[PDB]
């Protein structure tokens, strides 16, 4: 008599697809209709604490990323102090600063190489 597309039969099948046939009618359900409220709250709290810790590790300790994937492009970071001066003054000062930076790198390298005998 009944046919598919009948709402009552569809509801019956939806509720009975995964039923426990060995149980009495009205109590033949297998799913849990809820989750322990206090347990879930505490679990989510501790999970959030762990996630925050992992993220802080990722952020402040990128050593794993550096040694596993290499150094990625760094977002721009600079100061606009040089814009205060303009013209030949700016050009000469910029060239002097560039020369000083290169000389500083070389000075660091040579100092590291030379200072091997500082500690007697």
């Amino acid at each position: 008599g009944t046919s598919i597309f009948s709402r009552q039969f569809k509801k019956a099948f939806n509720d009975a697809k995964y039923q426990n046939l060995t149980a009495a009618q009205g109590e033949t359900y297998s799913h849990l209709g809820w989750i322990s409220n206090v347990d879930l709250r505490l679990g989510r709290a501790i999970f959030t604490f762990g996630v925050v810790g992992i993220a802080f590790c990722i952020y402040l300790e990128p050593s794993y990323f550096h040694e596993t994937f290499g150094h990625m492009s760094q977002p721009p970071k600079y100061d606009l102090i040089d814009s205060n001066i303009n013209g030949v003054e700016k050009k000469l000062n910029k060239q002097i600063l560039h020369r000083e930076h290169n000389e500083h790198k070389l000075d660091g390298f040579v100092s590291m190489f030379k200072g091997s005998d500082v500690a007697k």
């Binding site: 995964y18 297998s30 799913h31 989510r44 996630v51």
Partner: protein
């Protein structure tokens, strides 16, 4: 021309499958209830935990973020 081929062996496999007993399926149906089981990615939701993480990282940036030294390598 009387040669066993795809159709013949498809029928053989269908017959083999039909020979199974539904008793085991009936007793085990409860195991695979969709209302009762999910996947680890679905259960472990990072939506709000990531929001708290962002709040904490923002607080760090605006409290101790100033006093850090760039390390280029």
């Amino acid at each position: 021309a009387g040669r066993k081929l795809f159709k013949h062996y498809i029928n053989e496999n269908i017959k083999s499958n039909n020979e199974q007993k539904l008793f085991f399926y009936r007793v085990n149906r409860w195991r695979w209830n969709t209302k009762d089981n999910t996947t680890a990615p679905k259960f472990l939701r990072l939506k709000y935990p990531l929001l708290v993480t962002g709040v904490c990282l923002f607080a760090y940036d605006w409290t101790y973020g100033f006093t850090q030294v760039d390390a280029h390598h």
